[PDB]
């Protein structure tokens, strides 16, 4: 693509002072023809940089000495304060008329939002070799982070949902090998692929090479999601899509947090009654957590407020230079008034501030344990978004709400040690049982079961409880609104499921009477219009099923049971069907 003269230019370019690439050309012939074909290669590599990167690999060399420079100084704002839009959702297990009311317009509102998946990790540090969309929510059914959310959406928004999915070369070809595979179906999905970025082997900013002589890259941060949308397309952009089709909010979730379908809607709800033009997903944080704080901030005397995510160890520092927090903790789901981002994406080009923050060996030497390479957070967009323009606010929410899996077992328990959340895989699941039992207990099931752990993980270090088990598909519970779940179940006081039991239900089902003690499956019509299979005067009693510890002598055991550290033993199951 590149002619020759192109490619030489940009070499000659290279080596100027400022620039100083020189060695990335030691001992290669004079002019471009006399090049081998490895040469030519890198050379293409450098040029085809400019696609990707505002300005190319010139341009991505001045950023660096910009930053690099940034970084070498302290970072301290003129001014930091609470927000002033700060909002506090209600409960999630108590079904108020406010709740109820919120749910309600909430619900209305994702028919015209549209989805962002943040998807570009593997997880290796859980322990998990494969895309963590793929981990499973629970292991009762197995649906896949990926599945839940997606036919979620679709449920709220219908088969048509414009949806996101944000990869990258670590994630990309097995995401969709798994949209395949579980045969979703997803007409105005759109997976956007992150380019990875050249890296600096030094603090001169000089390129870094891999080990087979080849431009090394790096993840340039989810950040990359602004951009990646503003520059996809239908010869239409893909937000005036958006916009033509009357959507009217976007929200962006991550990858391994189920509780996002809870707080959405109210985030949504809140959004439109206070008019707010960005508004971060938060619960409230003790002051000793690796989460972000929402922070009202002014970076010179002189400069206007901006509310953004701040870290916690640039909050403290700038603190002194100038049972929880006053400040409310971001959890990255966050949710926009269309046309308000649309309008900041345009301005910008997807390009948010960016930054560096380099490994180094010592502590004084200056020496890269690693290449370096420049970054940019997804929420860093919230810096474009100017007091006097826009309204940016957070909505506080109850912290069992949050229920990432981001830790290996082994951090887990060394977590806990110091009286903070695990958020792995085993507190991830059981979490995720306890909130179906909280949403139906809120609209009057009566539910009646021990708070003591059934199995121990991690070395004897913490317990958690799964049962009594109960999931809902989304055609059975539909949106998951409280008011969803009443039609599952409209004599709530008739259904009596015991602490050790499973409830597993699929399809177009109404239950109205069971006694169960033990494990059931209830399948309906798969097409949410059929006619409902009814469920009355139900009687279900067998072994059931039950959870052990995996023993550390440890074989069918995967990365998936060894991440929690116990394992479900599936022994007996009632069906009924048609």
Known sequence: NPSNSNLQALREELCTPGLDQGHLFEGWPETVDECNERQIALLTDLYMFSNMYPGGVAQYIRNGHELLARESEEVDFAALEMPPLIFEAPSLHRRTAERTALENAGTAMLCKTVFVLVAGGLGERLGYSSIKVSLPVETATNTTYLAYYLRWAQRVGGKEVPFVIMTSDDTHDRTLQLLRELQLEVPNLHV??????????????????????????????????????????????????????????????????????????????????????????????????????????????????????????????????????????????????????????????????????????????????????????????????????????????????????????????????????????????????????????????????????????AKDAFGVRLFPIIVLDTVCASSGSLDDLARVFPTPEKVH?????????????????????????????????????????????????????????????????????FVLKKTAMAVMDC
């Open 192 to 457: 956007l692929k992150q380019g990875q970025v050249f890296c600096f082997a030094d603090s001169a900013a000089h390129l870094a090479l891999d080990e087979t002589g080849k431009l090394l890259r790096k993840p340039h941060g989810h950040g990359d999601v602004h951009s990646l949308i503003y520059n996809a397309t239908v010869a239409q952009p893909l937000v005036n899509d958006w916009l033509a089709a009357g959507y009217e909010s976007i929200v962006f979730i991550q990858d391994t947090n189920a509780g996002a379908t809870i707080t959405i809607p109210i985030s949504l709800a809140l959004s439109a009654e206070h008019s707010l033009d960005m508004n971060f997903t938060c619960i409230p944080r003790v002051p000793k957590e690796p989460i972000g704080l929402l922070c009202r901030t002014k970076k010179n005397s002189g400069d206007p407020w901006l509310v953004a995510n701040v870290e916690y160890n640039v909050f403290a520092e700038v603190s002194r230079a100038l049972g929880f927090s006053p400040f409310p903790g971001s959890v990255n789901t966050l949710v926009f008034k269309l046309s308000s981002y649309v309008d900041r994406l345009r301005e910008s080009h997807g390009i948010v501030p960016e930054f560096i923050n380099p490994k180094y060996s010592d502590e004084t030497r200056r020496s890269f344990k690693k290449p370096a390479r420049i970054e940019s957070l997804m929420q860093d967009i919230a810096l474009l978004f100017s007091e006097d323009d826009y309204r940016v606010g957070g909505t506080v929410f109850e912290r069992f709400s949050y229920q990432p899996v981001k830790n290996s077992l082994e951090e887990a328990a060394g977590l806990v040690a110091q009286g903070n959340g695990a958020y792995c895989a085993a507190t991830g699941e059981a979490a995720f049982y306890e909130l179906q039992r909280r949403r139906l207990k809120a609209i009057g099931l009566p539910l009646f079961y021990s708070s003591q752990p059934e199995v121990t993980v």
């Open 497 to 565: 499921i015991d602490q050790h039991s499973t409830l597993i239900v699929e399809g177009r089902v109404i239950i109205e009477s069971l006694e169960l003690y033990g494990a059931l499956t209830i399948r309906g019509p798969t097409d949410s219009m059929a006619l409902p299979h009814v469920v009355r005067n139900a009687v279900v009693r067998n072994a059931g099923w039950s959870v052990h510890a995996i023993l550390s002598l440890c074989s069918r055991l995967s990365e998936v049971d060894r991440i929690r550290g």
